[PDB]
Amino acid sequence: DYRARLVYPFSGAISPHADIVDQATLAWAAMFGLLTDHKSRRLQYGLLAARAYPRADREMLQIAADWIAWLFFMDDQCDETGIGRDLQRMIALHERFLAILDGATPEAHDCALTYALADLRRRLALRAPDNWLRRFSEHVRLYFTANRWETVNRQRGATPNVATYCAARLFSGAVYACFDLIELAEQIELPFYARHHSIVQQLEQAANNIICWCNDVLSYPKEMQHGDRHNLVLVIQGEHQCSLPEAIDRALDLHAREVATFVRKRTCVPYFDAAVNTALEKYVTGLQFWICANRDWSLTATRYA
Numbered sequence: 001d002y003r004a005r006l007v008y009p010f011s012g013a014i015s016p017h018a019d020i021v022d023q024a025t026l027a028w029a030a031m032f033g034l035l036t037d038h039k040s041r042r043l044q045y046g047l048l049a050a051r052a053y054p055r056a057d058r059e060m061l062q063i064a065a066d067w068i069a070w071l072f073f074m075d076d077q078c079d080e081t082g083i084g085r086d087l088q089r090m091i092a093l094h095e096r097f098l099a100i101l102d103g104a105t106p107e108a109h110d111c112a113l114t115y116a117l118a119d120l121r122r123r124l125a126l127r128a129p130d131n132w133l134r135r136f137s138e139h140v141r142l143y144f145t146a147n148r149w150e151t152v153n154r155q156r157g158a159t160p161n162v163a164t165y166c167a168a169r170l171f172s173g174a175v176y177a178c179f180d181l182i183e184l185a186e187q188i189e190l191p192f193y194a195r196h197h198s199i200v201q202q203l204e205q206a207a208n209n210i211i212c213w214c215n216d217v218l219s220y221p222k223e224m225q226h227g228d229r230h231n232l233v234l235v236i237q238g239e240h241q242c243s244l245p246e247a248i249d250r251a252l253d254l255h256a257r258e259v260a261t262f263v264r265k266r267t268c269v270p271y272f273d274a275a276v277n278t279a280l281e282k283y284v285t286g287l288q289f290w291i292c293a294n295r296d297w298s299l300t301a302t303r304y305a
């Protein structure tokens, strides 16, 4: 229990719609045939989304919850089945996803994950401009690239060094794609010059590292159980040749250090104008809601028990 070593100087919130949103995710999952088997009521994927996007209108929060569900269903295929150890099969599947992200219609014998991604594309297109769909699609593309990088590690029995793992981990988690949904949840449109400012990129990177490293500390047990080493704890242990307790200590020191980086750089956002800065503060608060949502959900979730 590492609760006491996962403290943030900011709190999160949860949408009042959390439980109805979760039930609507199980409907969507059944409807698209993503539920394998019998236990499904303990996935609670909607309760993650409810915390990550706590001021979203119910219809946007439902897209986010179905998107988070999609990522977990995809991720357990990558991390707990043979497709995550076969690059050729991953490439074949990612080519259908990327065709669907460009707006192509699923074919009759495209898999359930393909039909479901096309549903989420269609629904995001109803709520997002073309500029946003492009940014989101490109973040999702890099997630697929990170997933294929994991597959080659699995195929080779490789373990990357800390520097390589941390840099690839920023993409393997799809957190940048989940961050794009903050704009829709908060009904904001950041101008290109604010979106890409060095400090905003450093805050996004910081927040993504925190969410991934927090996840790594809480998920090393189940990842060890599937002989998987895409985890800061296991990668530190391999690099420093230290005890599991010492690797966990080092992982949590990196997590803590990253919280410090995020909190300090929050104070370094340039003043563009009242409007832009109000929209950026909503976005940066969004990153904080995600940081809290990841920890608060993961501590209570069957998935890490």
Ligand SMILES: C/C=C(\C)CC/C=C(\C)CCC=C(C)C
Pocket (backbone or CB within 6 Å): 068, 071, 072, 075, 172, 173, 174, 175, 178, 211, 212, 215, 294
């Ligand atoms: C995936 C990024 C994390 C490791 C934890 C935060 C969870 C999500 C952003 C949605 C679920 C996505 C998975 C790839 C598990």
Ligand SMILES: [Mg+2]
Pocket (backbone or CB within 6 Å): 075, 076, 079
């Ligand atoms: Mg996983």
Ligand SMILES: [Mg+2]
Pocket (backbone or CB within 6 Å): 075, 078, 079, 172
């Ligand atoms: Mg994974």
Ligand SMILES: [Mg+2]
Pocket (backbone or CB within 6 Å): 215, 216, 219, 220, 223
């Ligand atoms: Mg994990």
